[PDB]
Structure formats: structure tokens, C-alpha cells
Amino acid sequence: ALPRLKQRYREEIREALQQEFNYANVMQIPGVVKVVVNMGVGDAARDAKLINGAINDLALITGQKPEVRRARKSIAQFKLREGMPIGARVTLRGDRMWEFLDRLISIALPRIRDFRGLSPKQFDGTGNYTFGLNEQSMFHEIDVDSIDRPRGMDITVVTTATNDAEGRALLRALGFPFKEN
Amino acid sequence: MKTGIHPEYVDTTVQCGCGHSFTTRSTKQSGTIVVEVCSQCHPFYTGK
Amino acid sequence: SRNGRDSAAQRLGVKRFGGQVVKAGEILVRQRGTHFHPGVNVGRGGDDTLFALAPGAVEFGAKRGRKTVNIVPVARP
Amino acid sequence: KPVGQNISEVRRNARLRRHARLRKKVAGTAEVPRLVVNRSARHIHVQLVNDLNGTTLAAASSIEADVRAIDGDKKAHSVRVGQLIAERAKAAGVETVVFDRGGYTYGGRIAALADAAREAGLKF
Amino acid sequence: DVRPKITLACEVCKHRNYITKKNRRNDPDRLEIKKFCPNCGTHQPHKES
RNA sequence: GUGUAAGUGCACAAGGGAGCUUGACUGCGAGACGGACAUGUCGAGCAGGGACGAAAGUCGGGACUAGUGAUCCGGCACCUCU
RNA sequence: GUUACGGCGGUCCAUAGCGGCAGGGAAACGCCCGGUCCCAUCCCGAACCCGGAAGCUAAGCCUGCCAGCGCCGAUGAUACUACCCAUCCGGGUGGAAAAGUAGGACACCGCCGAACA
């Protein structure tokens, strides 16, 4: 019993990337490592309840309890003080990460209103992708009747890639809906 | 795994407009998930 | 003028120098920080005062880049 | 050319650093030597060190074929290795030691072998 | 006022009293601490008086 | 960055986090520093009874140096004193 | 006794570091596979722990070579200075820098243990 995305990466995607880049040793095949979802509330500095709403949204979508991030710096323009909750974060690894990736790619992304594609320019040197949503309605794990206010995220997919090209190739093989440039 | 810290998990069958039965884990408790659109039918994935 | 205020001199510094023979418990240096670190047979006090734990001769050395104070067990007659 | 550090780098540096931070309080003498244990994924090793002279009065490991023959688990191998270090210290004239855990946590194999040494006549 | 002088009579009689200060608004309730009592020779709890 | 001035320190952390806890002890104290005197300061180690730790061990408040007032007179608690 | 070996320590703790180029897996060192058991995440078997060895030296590690960056660093001379002369200017005896240069340097030593004799 294996996640189908993990099965695919193990069998066909690994061989494809090995052919494409001709890695000298078997352990250069760039694979994903973990997925991090960030929901920076910001407005929680006034009202604490928004952090709990973010907690519930992340727990329902990703499937595991999120970790509240403390404000490590005090600032007055955002009237931020040290220690109050600011955002939530979940680190996804292994089978849970694979199944979340499958769910998002095959269900959540096409549910985006006028979804035209994700720019393949968002990698940073080492082929780690970081995009960001605006609302949370795309997931059916949450309910539009249940929700009351949109809450975007920052999904980060750190891989074993060393270059932007290798990372974009691996993610494109994974089934990522990139644009064309 | 801390036991009482996470929500429930269940194998859920995702149903698209194409007719594909998708036995996979999720937290929705309906058993079978039905959705109108997915990667197998969306115009961007299908080039339309 | 605002000025005119100062505190008393604290008489800090090194009390026993290299080669001096001392008894156990004798104060070696009076310092604020850990300008000298304790070495062998040398303890550190609440106010970061170095003192001797055994009789012997004071020896100043450096351990991994820190200046240290040690006590050498002088030979019994 | 991988972009950053390997996981083995992080593990090795962290273990060396946290072995050093505990060596602040633990040092071995002639009559009271330091029992420092190095644990690997496939093996475990122990030595008896007199830190003033920088010597080694006794040593034991799972490398030895005599202790390789036990079919027991890794914990069983550690228990046996603790027994060997115990009676080799006995033959070395050493009675009391100080247990250096080598930057590993005190649990599992290391705890099992330390308890084996404690029961086998090494007071620490 | 705040951090005033407060007294801990040995719960086990003995009239053994330790003194110390505490913030009377951080800890409005009476302080309870287990302390050594000389005449009993044991570590008995002490209550704020 | 270290609660707080400045300085001497601290990345080996004395800086950040968590678990348990009250040593912010009782009887003492070799030896010292500083000093007109009165003050002040450090202190290993011993005993009792504890905390933490597998253990070694550490703990007589706080990284250190300010946060204070002699004597007289009187109040309160206890004592096998009168 | 020997090996491109693993550990535990050193040295007024870089002359040692960093970087570049070329190599290796005998036992070891690792990466690695998995979460059934001890144990763990302020969420995450990522880490800690446990159970294994299918794969791999791409990394760690260590070997050889590079002065490239850092680092160490004379002698001489000078600055400064104690004492003494000197009406000022300055001088005599002694001590003697920092900087800079010549240069050194891609560490050395100790104790165990692996594989080999």
C-alpha cells in the first residue's frame, strides 16, 4: 500500500529525470522533501480568534494540527509585540505530504476561479517552489457555509533539487500546472 | 504521533465528472467524495 | 553642572602573581567578568572571584585562547 | 555540488558539540576513569579513559567476533558489550568509573549497556 | 505596596517563620512553600501568615 | 541578546526552549580580600534534611558590580532563661 | 610492524581554518529502508529513539596536490622610553615597539581499536 504519487515518483519520474539529466550516481535524483503551508494572519494582533480560525482551516485542509508561530520581533507600524500569535504553520513529510500533494494537484488547483496556471519562475536557486493562494474555498475539506472570511496560504515545496531547472522539471513531471515562458 | 491532537482520517473515494473512483485517504467522513471538476476534466490540464 | 557623582573604587585586580605560594581558600584575583578563567585547583565565586582550592604556587596559563589561573602542587620537603 | 549541508554533517556536528558540552563536567582519572561510549547504527563501542594522561585502560565493542556471535538484538549486543567492559575493568583494577554518554541521549542501547555494566560490578 | 515583607509560619506549628517578599498582585493568594524546619528537623510545608 | 545605567564578560554560552521543583535552606565554616575604625566581600569543606539527575554531580537566589540606614527605643512569634 | 582506516585526547588551539583540483568504502564511518516494540515532535519517525541492511561513496570522513583567501612571522631601522648630561636646542648609556618586509605555513604529537603480517 503506497500513495499513487509516491509510486509514480519511485517508478516513472525517477527514471525520467535520470534520463533527462544523466546523474552520475543514483542518489542525485531530485525528490521532494517536505511541504510547508504558512497562513500569516497578521490581523490576529488585534483579535486572537483569527489565529484559532487559521488553526482550524489548516487542521482541516492539511489533516494535522498546525503550529502557532510567535512574533519574534516587535514593530509599531503593524503594532506588533513580541509573543503574540501571528501565523500558523504545518510541516508535511512522507505519506501525508504525498497524499496532500495528490489532493491539491488533482482537486484543489482546478477548483481555483479562472485558474490559468502557476508561473514556473517562482523557484529560488535550489528549485524550491513557493506560491500563494488567496482564499481557502478550493479544498472541499472545508465548507463554504462553515467558512466566514478568506484565508490564503504560502505552500512551499522544498525538494532535493540543486538548480531551478531540475526543480521545475521534477515538479512538471509530478503534474504541476505551470504556465509557459 | 500524539494521539488526541489530530483530526480523523479515512480512505475516501473522490468522484469527478469523468467517472473515476479515487480510493485515497482524507478527513471527509462521507466515505465517497463527489466533485464536479478535477485534473482529468479541467480545460487547462486538457488544453482547452 | 549635572556632573559630580562617582562610585567608590572597588580595588579589583590580581592579588597573587605567578610563583607566589598560597593556602587553600586564598583569593587570587578580584574581577568583574571572567577576564581570567579558573584552571586546575581554582574555583570561581559568586562575584566571579577566583580562589585557590589547594595549596601551591600560582601559575598563569592559556587554555583554548582564554587566560586561566592554575595552582601547581609544590613539592613537599 | 549540493546546495547546503548533508544530514550527516548536521548529525555529526551536533553530536560532537553536545558531547563537548557534557565533557565540561565529566573527566576521567586513573582510579576514576571516564567510560565514554560511541554508538553507531550498526555497532557500539566503549573505552575507559584517564583524561590526565590521555590513555585507554580498557575497551570493548561489537566489532569483536566473540560478541558478534550472539543472535540477540542490538540491545542484546550492547548488554554483552557492557559485560565485557565491566570485567575488563575488573581485570584492569578499576572499580569506580564515571559514565560518559558521548553526546547521545541516555536511553535504548546505551542505557541497556550502562545498566549491564552497573549490575556487573562497575559502580557508577 | 508590592513585594512587601511577608512571613511563612511553619504549617507544622513550631512557630518556625521564614520571611521573604512577593508581588501582592501577581500572587494575591497566600504563598505556600515547603521548607526545612529546624526543631522538627524535616521539610514541612510553610504557609503565609 | 543578556529585566534595568555603564563597564568587564558570556556563542563552550551567562543568549533561546521544555520537564520537575523551592537550596530565595538549618548548624557551621579552614583560609582569605578590602580596610583608621565601624561597615563590606569571597569562600572550599563538614553535618541534618531535601530538589533535580541513570549517574557523576550541582543547588546556602538572580552573568557580575547599585536597589540602601548604625545605635537607642518599642512591637510581634518561639525558648528546658530569670 | 604496516593501511587513502575508526575513535578518545593534547598544543601559550588557524603554521591547524576556509577555498580549489584530483581519489576510496577491507573492517569500520556514514548516507539508506521502516515505524512493530522503548522513546519523540511547542505540528512533522525532519530531528530524538527503536528494528534492519536492499542500494550508494553523490555527500560526511579521510588521502594527495595547490599560498588563492585567511593565519603566523623575523633581523635591521625607527617611534617611544628609565637614568644622566645639558642655560633652550639637543646629546650619552640601557630597554625597545606597532606597522612593513624577508620568510613560514595546505598542521604536529599521544593512547586505544579495526584490516593485513
Say how many Å lie between the first and final Cα of chain D, rounded. 47
Q: Please say whether the beta carbons of A35 and A92 come within 8 A.
A: yes
Q: How many Å from the N-terminal Cα to the C-terminal Cα in chain A?
A: 38
How long is the CA D77 to C1' G3 vector, in angstroms?
28
User: D110: how many CB neighbours lie within 10 A of its CB?
Assistant: 21
Residues C65 and C38 sit within 8 Å (Cβ to Cβ): no
Residues of A in contact with B22 (CB under 8 A): 106
Give the contacts of B31 (CB within 8 A, at least 6 positions apart). B10, B12, B13
Q: Which nucleotides of G are covered by protein (CB under 7 A)?
A: 7-14, 27-32, 35, 38-53, 55-61, 110-115
Q: CB contact, 8 Å: D41 with chain A? A: no
Beta strand pairing call for C27-30 and A85-93: unpaired
> Which residues of chain D lie closer than 8 angstroms to A125, CB-CB?
3
Measure the CA–CA gap between A96 and D47, rounded to whole angstroms. Answer: 43
Report d(CA C39, CA D46) in Å as an integer: 28
Annotated binding site of B for Zn(2+): 16, 18, 38, 41
C19 CA to F43 C1', in Å?
Answer: 22
DSSP A41: -
Measured between alpha carbons, how far is D105 from E4 in angstroms, rounded to an integer? 45
CA angle D109, D110, D112 (to 5 degrees): 65
C-alpha cell at D54: 590521555
Residue of D nearest to A163 (CA): D3
Q: Is there a contact between C42 and C70 (Cβ–Cβ < 8 Å)?
A: yes
Cα B34 to Cα A59, B22, B23, B25, C56, distances in angstroms: 21, 10, 12, 14, 86
Q: How far is CA B3 from the centre of its chain?
A: 24
Resolution (A): 2.7
Please give the C-alpha separations between residue D67 and each of B6, D64, D84, D109, in angstroms, as whole numbers: 44, 6, 9, 15
DSSP letters of chain C? ------PPP---EESS-TT-EE-TT-EEEE-SS-SSEE-TTEEE-TTS-EEESSSEEEEEEEETTEEEEEEE-PPP-
Beta bridge partners of A47: none
Residue D6, min C-alpha distance to chain A (Å): 11
Other C-beta atoms lying within 10 Å of the C-beta of residue D20: 10
* 8 A C-beta contact, residue D99 and residue D114: yes
Strand partners, A34: A93, A158
| Crossing angle (nearest 10°) for helices A164-174 and A14-21 | 150
- The nucleotide whose C1' lies nearest the CA of D115 is F54
C1’ F6 / CA C63, Å: 29
- How far apart are the C-alpha atoms of B24 and B35, rounded to whole Å? 14
Contacts (Cβ under 8 Å, ≥6 apart) of B14: A106, A107, B20, B21, B22, B24, B26, B33, B35, B38
D93 touches chain A (CB under 8 A): no
Q: Cα separation of A123 and A165, whole Å?
A: 9
Q: Which three cell numbers stand for residue B4?
A: 488526541
Q: What is the CA radius of gyration of chain E?
A: 11
Method used to obtain the model: cryo-EM
In A, which residues are within 8 Å of B8 by CB distance? none
**What beta strand segments (E) does chain A contain?**
32-40, 67-70, 85-93, 129-132, 154-159
- Grid look-up 488526541 returns B4
Q: For residue D45, what are the contacts with CB-CB under 8 A and spacing of at least 6?
A: D37, D38, D39, D59, D60, D61, D62, D63, D81
Residue contact A177–B45, C-beta within 8 A: yes
Sign of CA dihedral A89, A91, A96, A100: positive
Per the listing, cell 472570511 goes with A149
Strand order in the sheet with B21-26: B21-26, B10-15, B32-34
The number of C-alpha atoms within 13 Å of C6 and in the hemisphere containing its C-beta is 4
- Strands D34-39 and D98-100 come out as parallel
SS (H, E, C) chain D: CCCCCCHHHHHHHHHHHHHHHHHCCCCCCCCCCEEEEEECCCCEEEEEEECCCCEEEEEEECCCHHHHCCCCCHHHHHHHHHHHHHHHHHHCCCCECEEECCCCCCCCHHHHHHHHHHHCCCEC
3-state secondary structure of A49: helix
Domains, in order of start, for chain D: 25-124 (3.30.420.100)
Q: Give the H/E segment covering residue B25.
A: strand B21-26
- Output the nine-digit C-alpha cell for A116: 490559468
